[PDB]
Structure formats: C-alpha cells, structure tokens
Amino acid sequence: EITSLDTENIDEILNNADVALVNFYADWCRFSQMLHPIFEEASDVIKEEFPNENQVVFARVDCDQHSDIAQRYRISKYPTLKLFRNGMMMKREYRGQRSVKALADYIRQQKSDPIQEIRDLAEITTLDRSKRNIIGYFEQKDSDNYRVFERVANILHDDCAFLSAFGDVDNIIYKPPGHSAPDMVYLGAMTNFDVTYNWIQDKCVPLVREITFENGEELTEEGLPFLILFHMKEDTESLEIFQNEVARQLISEKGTINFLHADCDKFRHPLLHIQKTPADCPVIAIDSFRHMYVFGDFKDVLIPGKLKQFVFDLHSGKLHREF
C-alpha cells in the first residue's frame, strides 16, 4: 500500500528502501487529488513486479499536515514526485506523464542496470570528447565491488557513461571528454560506497558551472539557492579563486547549493538587480530567487572564514539589509 510518511517514520522508511517514489501533495490542489488513484494503481503494478519488500516503495507526504518535511525537501509546488534511492534524493523529479504505465515504466527504468558491458578492450578506442566515461574492471559481475559500482551508476548514469569489463588488474578508471587529459584511476576501496561515489561524483558533476539564461531554466528548477560569481569572461582569475575557495570552505554544501559563475556582460540585468555594474565584476552573490545578496568586496573570499559563514547566514537567515 502507500505509506503515509511523517516526521517519525520518514528517515528509516526512505533509507531502507532501495527505490522510493514519494508523492508530495496537498489536497486543496486538484492536480494532487487527480494524482492519488493513478499513484495507488501504479504502486500495485510495481509491487507485483517486485517487492522482496524493499526493492521499490511508493510513499506519500501531506504537506498541509507536515510542512517540516515539505521544506526539508524544498517542495515549492503540488504535486511533486521525488526519487530516493537509499534515502539520498535524486536531483531530477519525475516530470513525466501522469499515468499508470508512465510511472510504471519510470520505476522499471530506474531499477534497470545502467552499466554497459564490453569485450576486453573493444570500443575504448573511440568514445571521447562528447561525454565523460568511466569503466569498471571486474573478473565477474557478482562482487561487492560491482554492486557498489552499480549503485554509483544508478545515481550518476545521467552525467556519465558507466561500463564494465574483465581481464585487467578489480579497478575502475575515469576518462574525461577528450583525448588530452588521461586517467585518473581510482585507488580507493571498491567495497566502500561513500568514497567510491565521492570519487566518481567528483569527475561526473562539476562543483560550480556556468549559468546562462538559456539553461537558466533547468538550473532554476533544481530548487536550490544560487551562489554566483559574476565575472567578465576574459577574467579567469576570479573564477579559479572562486572554484578553489568553495572547494575549501563549502564542499559540504555541494548538493544544498548550486555554485555557478556567470558571464558578467550577458547577465547585466541580474547584476542590475543589485548595486553593481558589469565593470564591478568580480562579484559574489546568493540568488534565493527571492532576493540577491552581495558578498562584499571580492578579496575577503581569501580569508578561510568569510565564504563559509556567508552561506551559513543564508541558512541562518541573518541580515536583510538592505537593499
């Protein structure tokens, strides 16, 4: 059946489930009520294709009742369906059609194996530029190494291609987009999911990247408060100071914050939204999509303190001020 989550059972139920599709709803909204039956039926259809009781879990949250849970996951609309693998929340919501077969095919898709097998050294000839690649080398496809690799693949298969092989001395290797930079071979323990996912996570998804008003859309619907370096595109120095410094201070915020840099001249009006002009760049600000907060003078980013406490003051809601 559909578990109704609350503050007490939320964590355990989502953590022990290998897949959990949870429906964040409010019943004063008709789209939610229209969703509930299709959700129940899709849940049954998947429950027969499964369970061993933990494979796939359909749950629900009434955000009227539990607003705590709602804001924890930053639910801005109703309904929203979210995918939790082991209790990590996948950053891509279900935006698909709302129907029993669409939801069903979706659960089947995410329960599928994203890793693609290969014959010894076969096409490692040409993949590159284009996307990133990573390939694990396993003498057998039943091993703790390969199940770890398969979890990391399930989360990360969108930002990289995962493959598997046999015959090399068990190890996974990373190939970036091009033939310029080589591997980059993982030396860590392949029985530890956290260090392995941190490692491949490190190559797949950049810590900061460029906002442009074209993909402004995609990144706005990530649902995260922005921290932006506005800089002229000839200026690469501010940008690597920024990358290095958010890697030092804020890396624990990797998934609660989108760290982005913007070309200072195209985003003039985003910069017009504050006291700054395109020649005031380098400029650091948080965009909560409600207001923008300047960091102050750029160079203060070099003291070990300032940038870390700058973001905890958005998380503490410190001073507004001014405009």
Partner: protein, 175 residues
C-alpha cells in the same frame, strides 16, 4: 455579442446568490450607490484551487472601507454553489466564503459580459469594476485559475474614485 463597454452602463443582471449559506435574490441595481467588483469564478473542469474567492473574501473589509462590494458569479445553480461551499476545501471545495456567489444558470450574464465560451460552456475569468452609478469602468480578462489581485483591484477602485472627485487635476505622483 458582448454588451460590456467602458463608460456605458454595465449590463443588468439578476439571479439567485448564496450569501452566508442561504439563498438571496440579487440584482445589479442592489449595488447602486457603491462600487461593485464583479468577477466570474468557474467551478467546472478548469477548476484548480479555492485560492481566489478565499483571497477576495478575507480582504472584503478593505473593499468596504472604500465603499466597494464584491460578488463572484458562476454558471452553476445555487444548489451546487451551496454544495461547493459545504465541501471543505481540503477535499476540493470552497468551504465557507464571505462574498455572494451568483448563479448564471441561463448563461446570459456570462454572454452579456462576453466571458462565456459557447464551445465548452466555460467562463473566462473576467473581473469588472462598476462605479456607484452603474457605469462599467474596468474589464480584465484572462483564463488563469489564479488569478486576479486584490491589491491591484483596490488600487483600480481608488484610481476611479480619485478621477471622479478630482478630474481636471494632475496629482503630484505623476511625473
């Protein structure tokens, strides 16, 4: 086919409304002497959420400060209006509302105001501001479930009353 025109008398209407859970007979000329904001509020398949009537009803005292009444109108009967009112809004109803819900069962009000779409039976969300002499001063049309704005509606009402009392002067607020 629309009879709604700016600066001419607003098209007459009369019908049965639900006021405070009971049926009252309502006429446009009942509101003569006060400003009336009159808007259409479809309860049909386009319906999405109670938000707009709740917003307008909760702030209705602000409208009465400026000598303005609010009434919503829909193409359902008084009985389904009361059914909607008695349906709690958690379950997809309106719950209690503090502005009259007028019934256009004959559809000729929605057509006189040019808000009726004869293909679907659906009413666009029109909002109309009618001055204390029955003249139509504002037409706002869109199909947004929500919505109109209580703030800009009262701002429009005050702009019309200021024009009526000071008509040959420019206020300093214009630049």
């Amino acid at each position: 086919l629309s009879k709604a025109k700016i600066s001419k008398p607003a098209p007459y209407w009369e019908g049965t409304a639900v006021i405070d859970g009971e049926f009252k007979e309502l006429k446009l000329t009942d509101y003569r002497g006060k400003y009336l904001v009159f808007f259409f509020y479809p309860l049909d398949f386009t319906f999405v959420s109670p938000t707009e009537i709740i917003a307008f009803g909760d702030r209705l005292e602000e409208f009465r400060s400026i000598n303005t009444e609010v009434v919503a109108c829909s193409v359902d009967s008084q009985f389904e209006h009361l059914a909607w009112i008695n349906t709690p809004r958690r379950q997809g109803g309106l719950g209690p509302i503090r502005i009259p819900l007028l019934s256009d069962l004959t559809h000729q009000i929605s057509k006189d105001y040019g808000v009726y779409l004869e293909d679907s039976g659906h009413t666009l969300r029109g909002l109309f501001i009618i001055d204390d002499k029955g003249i139509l001063r504002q037409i706002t049309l869109n199909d947004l479930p929500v919505g109109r704005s209580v703030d800009e509606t009262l701002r429009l009402v005050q702009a019309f009353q200021y024009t009526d009392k000071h008509g040959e002067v420019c206020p300093a607020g214009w630049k």
